[PDB]
Structures are given as structure tokens and as C-alpha cells.
Amino acid sequence: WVIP
Amino acid sequence: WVIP
Amino acid sequence: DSCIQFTRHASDVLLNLNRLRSRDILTDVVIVVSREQFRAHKTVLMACSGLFYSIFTDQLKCNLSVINLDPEINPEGFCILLDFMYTSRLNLREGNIMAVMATAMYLQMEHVVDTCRKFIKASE
Amino acid sequence: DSCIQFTRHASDVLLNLNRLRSRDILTDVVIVVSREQFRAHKTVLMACSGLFYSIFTDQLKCNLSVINLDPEINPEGFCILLDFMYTSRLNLREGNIMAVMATAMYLQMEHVVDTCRKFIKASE
Ligand SMILES: O=C1Cc2cc(Nc3nc(Cl)ncc3F)ccc2N1
Ligand SMILES: O=C1Cc2cc(Nc3nc(Cl)ncc3F)ccc2N1
Ligand SMILES: [Cl-]
Ligand SMILES: [Cl-]
Structure with missing residues (x-):
């Protein structure tokens, strides 16, 4: 999961 | 396009 | 090969599938x-979703055009997860995380259940 | 947001859609x-594909379960492009590049047409  |  | x-x-495929959903094109349930x-x-x-995979591989249920979820499921939680399915983006907030996690457990969406567990653990 | x-x-979505195709699950054309x-x-x-987008957004054609392509289209070229749609991988070879490019132009798959043009230019 990432900060888009 | 890339070499997978 | x-x-x-x-x-x-x-x-790009997923973005186009979400555009078809927006436009109600070829939606079938x-x-x-x-x-x-x-x-x-x-x-x-x-x-x-593991739950939808099981539902639509069933010889009788594959033909249904309407599926009713368990009454305990929160519509906002479902909406957030449906948006995630079509976009890869999850709108996870303090006010919705419990409903989102409960819905993802029911729908059998293991990666979502994983990030919810981690965000909850961080607040404890 | x-x-x-x-x-x-x-x-992961695309891999699962290809698994459904393999297993002939919910294929509809x-x-x-x-x-x-x-x-x-x-x-x-x-x-x-821009061609399939146009076909299945047509009020009459959206309901067809069989679509016949132009007789000039090469089945191997189509097969290679169908595999690309479901996997992101394109089996481009000296022996098939002309048929693949012609099929991608017909199907309106601009990124494929682009890599074919580049590979052809490199051999000239
Ligand atoms: O957490 C999850 C997400 C998820 C999706 C699927 N989907 C499919 N699985 C296979 Cl093997 N082939 C085709 C499919 F559409 C099954 C189980 C699970 N569990
Ligand atoms: O080279 C290409 C690939 C391609 C795909 C599509 N697909 C869709 N386009 C839109 Cl805007 N919404 C939903 C779609 F399914 C249209 C044109 C083109 N041309
Ligand atoms: Cl997931
Ligand atoms: Cl393309």
C-alpha cells in the first residue's frame, strides 16, 4: 500500500 | 514497454 | 517466453472498466x-472478492441479476470497497475503518483486511 | 482525496480475469x-480495443453473442492480441509482427501499433  |  | x-x-484496463461502470455500460448485476x-x-x-468468486461460480447463482448481502453489512463500507475494486484506491478514514474492515472480511478481500488491521494496530 | x-x-485483477477466461467462466461473446x-x-x-468499445456500445450490437471479424484478419495475430489484452504481454516475433500490427490497427489498440512501428523501424 502507498500514498498515490 | 519493458522486458518482463 | x-x-x-x-x-x-x-x-489502463481497470480505469476503462471503471469508466464503463460510471456510464452503466454492460453492468450485469x-x-x-x-x-x-x-x-x-x-x-x-x-x-x-472471494465471496463474489464463490457466488458467481455457483451453477444457480451465476444466473441471478440481483444479490442481497447480509443485513449487517454497512452500505457506505460496501461503496468504499466497490470503489477500491474499480480503482485500487481505498478511502480509509477513522470514521469508516471498522465498517470497511468488517465488509472486507465478509467479501473475502484479504489485502484490504490486512491494511485495516495494520491501521487499527497503529492507533492502539 | x-x-x-x-x-x-x-x-491482480487482470490475472484473475485471465483465470476466468482460461476456465471459460462468465465469457459472454x-x-x-x-x-x-x-x-x-x-x-x-x-x-x-477502440473497435470493441464501439461495437459493444452500439444499442443493437451490444446484444450479439457472436462477432465476425473482417476475413483479412489473421487468427494468430488476433490470438496474440487477445492474450495481450488479458496479460499485458505481447508475443511479438519477426514472423508475426506484420499480422500483429495489421490486427492492432483494425482493433484500434494504439500502444500495440506504436511498439510494432518502432520494432519495424529498427529492422530497416
Ligand atoms: O482476498 C481475495 C481476493 C480474491 C479473488 C478471487 N478471484 C478469483 N480467484 C481465482 Cl484463483 N481465479 C479467478 C478469480 F476471479 C478469489 C479469492 C479471493 N480472495
Ligand atoms: O487504443 C485504444 C484502446 C481503447 C480502449 C477504449 N476503451 C474505452 N474507452 C473509454 Cl474512454 N471508456 C471505456 C472503455 F472501455 C476506447 C478506445 C481505445 N483506443
Ligand atoms: Cl483485497
Ligand atoms: Cl494497446
Whole structure:
């Protein structure tokens, strides 16, 4: 999961 | 396009 | 094999599937979550959720155009997860995380259940 | 928004859609390319091809379960492109590049037409  |  | 691969292909496919959903093009099922209705594509739901995969591989249920979820399921939680299926983006907030996690457990969306567990653990 | 994003989601969705195709699950159209037949999902075809997008948004054609392509289309070229739609991988070879490019122009798959043009230019 990432900060888009 | 890339070499997978 | 000796194939070449287009990096952005899968993301571009998913963006186009979400555009078809927006435009109600070739949607083939209505998911009912108490008083709310959500239109979607069975194939996208099966590709994202172990529960929908089991439902639409059943010889009788594969033919239904309406699926009613358990009354304990929160419509906002379902909406957030449906948006995630079609976009890869999850709108996880303090005010919705419990409903989102409960819905993802029911729908059998293991990666979502994983990030919810981690965000909850961080607040404890 | 303040969403989080699961990097591998779109690739995982596409892998599952290809598993449904393998297993002939919820395929809803047959594409005929002379003597050959290919089963697929209309939504995946529309998401990848400008020609299929135009076909399945037409009020009459959206309801067809069989689509016959132009007799000039090469079945191997079509097969290679159908595999690309469901996997992001293109099996481009000296012996098939002309048929693949001609098929991608017909199907309106601009990124494929682009890599074919580049590979052809490199050999000249
Ligand atoms: O957490 C999850 C997400 C998820 C999706 C699927 N989907 C499919 N699985 C296979 Cl093997 N082939 C085709 C599919 F559409 C099954 C189980 C699970 N569990
Ligand atoms: O080279 C290409 C690939 C391609 C795919 C599509 N697909 C869709 N386009 C839109 Cl805007 N919304 C939903 C779709 F399924 C249209 C045109 C083109 N041209
Ligand atoms: Cl997930
Ligand atoms: Cl393309």
C-alpha cells in the first residue's frame, strides 16, 4: 500500500 | 514497454 | 517466453472498466445492501472478492441479476470497497475503518483486511 | 482525496480475469476470425480495443453473442492480441509482427501499433  |  | 510487456496496461484496463461502470455500460448485476443498490460487472466483483468468486461460480447463482448481502453489512463500507475494486484506491478514514474492515472480511478481500488491521494496530 | 492505493491491485485483477477466461467462466461473446473461434468477456475487449468499445456500445450490437471479424484478419495475430489484452504481454516475433500490427490497427489498440512501428523501424 502507498500514498498515490 | 519493458522486458518482463 | 520472449514477450514484451506494457507496464501501464493493467491500470489502463481497470480505469476503462471503471469508466464503463460510471456510464452503466454492460453492468450485469445489482448488489443490494439493505436500502441501497449498487450496479457492477460480475467479472470485476469475482476478480476482487472471494465471496463474489464463490457466488458467481455457483451453477444457480451465476444466473441471478440481483444479490442481497447480509443485513449487517454497512452500505457506505460496501461503496468504499466497490470503489477500491474499480480503482485500487481505498478511502480509509477513522470514521469508516471498522465498517470497511468488517465488509472486507465478509467479501473475502484479504489485502484490504490486512491494511485495516495494520491501521487499527497503529492507533492502539 | 486522502485514499491509500494497493500497487498490485490492477495486475491482480487482470490475472484473475485471465483465470476466468482460461476456465471459460462468465465469457459472454465468441469472436470469429475466419475458421477460428475465441471466447472472451465483452468488458475486457471494450477496455482494450477502440473497435470493441464501439461495437459493444452500439444499442443493437451490444446484444450479439457472436462477432465476425473482417476475413483479412489473421487468427494468430488476433490470438496474440487477445492474450495481450488479458496479460499485458505481447508475443511479438519477426514472423508475426506484420499480422500483429495489421490486427492492432483494425482493433484500434494504439500502444500495440506504436511498439510494432518502432520494432519495424529498427529492422530497416
Ligand atoms: O482476498 C481475495 C481476493 C480474491 C479473488 C478471487 N478471484 C478469483 N480467484 C481465482 Cl484463483 N481465479 C479467478 C478469480 F476471479 C478469489 C479469492 C479471493 N480472495
Ligand atoms: O487504443 C485504444 C484502446 C481503447 C480502449 C477504449 N476503451 C474505452 N474507452 C473509454 Cl474512454 N471508456 C471505456 C472503455 F472501455 C476506447 C478506445 C481505445 N483506443
Ligand atoms: Cl483485497
Ligand atoms: Cl494497446
